[PDB]
Symmetry: D2
Amino acid sequence: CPLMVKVLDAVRGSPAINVAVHVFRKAADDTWEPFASGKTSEPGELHGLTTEEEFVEGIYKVEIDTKSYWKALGISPFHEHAEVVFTANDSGPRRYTIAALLSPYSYSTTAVVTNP
Amino acid sequence: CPLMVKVLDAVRGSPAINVAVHVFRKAADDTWEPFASGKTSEPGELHGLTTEEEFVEGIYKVEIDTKSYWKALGISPFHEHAEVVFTANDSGPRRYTIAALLSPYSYSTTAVVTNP
Amino acid sequence: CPLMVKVLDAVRGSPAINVAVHVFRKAADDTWEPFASGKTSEPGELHGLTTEEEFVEGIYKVEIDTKSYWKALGISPFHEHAEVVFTANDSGPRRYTIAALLSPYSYSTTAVVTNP
Amino acid sequence: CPLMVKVLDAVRGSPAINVAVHVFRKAADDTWEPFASGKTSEPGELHGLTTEEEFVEGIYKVEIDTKSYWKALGISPFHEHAEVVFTANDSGPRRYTIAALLSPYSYSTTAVVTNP
């Protein structure tokens, strides 16, 4: 798993479950092309997005469908989605965790990059 | 001001100066049209992006060029930029402050929305 | 002002009004002596806590009564309060802004430190 | 494990390793008495602080020794420590994760409370 997404709900103090997440990779022609997607699990995580072979260096975007999550809870949100845009770099072996901490009018995102 | 952006540096405990900011508005053909741009000042703020008249209802994207900010300080950060995407003015004119708090591998962004 | 506190509500996207704040200073006998207190105003700010003369070097604690804030809105939050503990003025007078961004089960706090 | 602590470094994008963490419980006489402590592991976590039997309802404080962590990295920090103060509540079965995301001049803390 070179790429995992973890989403937390700062209002309820809980994993954010059933959050849609879409990953895109920037193509040679500079448009965003679909790469992987899924929905977060009960632990708030999305595993199995990609493989070491497929996850080559390049620019990626992770879009987290925050608005739909809040709407499901009846809470009026600010953002359409949370967007995380980064370059994958081969720099020796690496695993990327993209974490997001959600509130209705605020989010934080952190990258935890480790070497197994 | 109907739209202001404020950027803070969590490493230095200071406003983030000279950060480039680009604002886009989603067009009828679902493309991101350039709307406004500027750079943060010494207090870490960007004022004067738009006017109440020009700032109509729509979906806006505020792009904060965090990578260039970090690189100029000698840090190779994780993200390319911070993106903030939101519907504005859909229940009438509001004033929006988009704040961002920057660290090399993490950022948070908050919206403060007031009714004039 | 040598010390200002600003508090934002991440649920509502608004300043956090009427939040009680208590400031302490560590005494020679290592107890926390009351230093100043107040409540945030409509812009979510608390000004006028102290003066450059009174705000000597020391270890200070800013206690933000977040629990009472949430409870008044109908939310049972996780934390009792937010505590911010720091050495101040040890390389001469500075101006400190202590910011806090509140959610029911999460908060962040940032310091912006400037030299007048 | 009814109580776990997880600490992340927002500057390096990594778990925060070898961070001292002290837990206190508020005694009948209203003073803070030592309850548990340890240092974070390579994954940035501290497990095994307490047991279900010992972790009774009451007010707890988790102190995270952030200053020492930054100092070890040669980075000048703002806070003496990060302090998390909360009431443990029996509300059916519960597991508490106290997460902290560290920057030199800012931290966030989140409680993730789940039911196994």
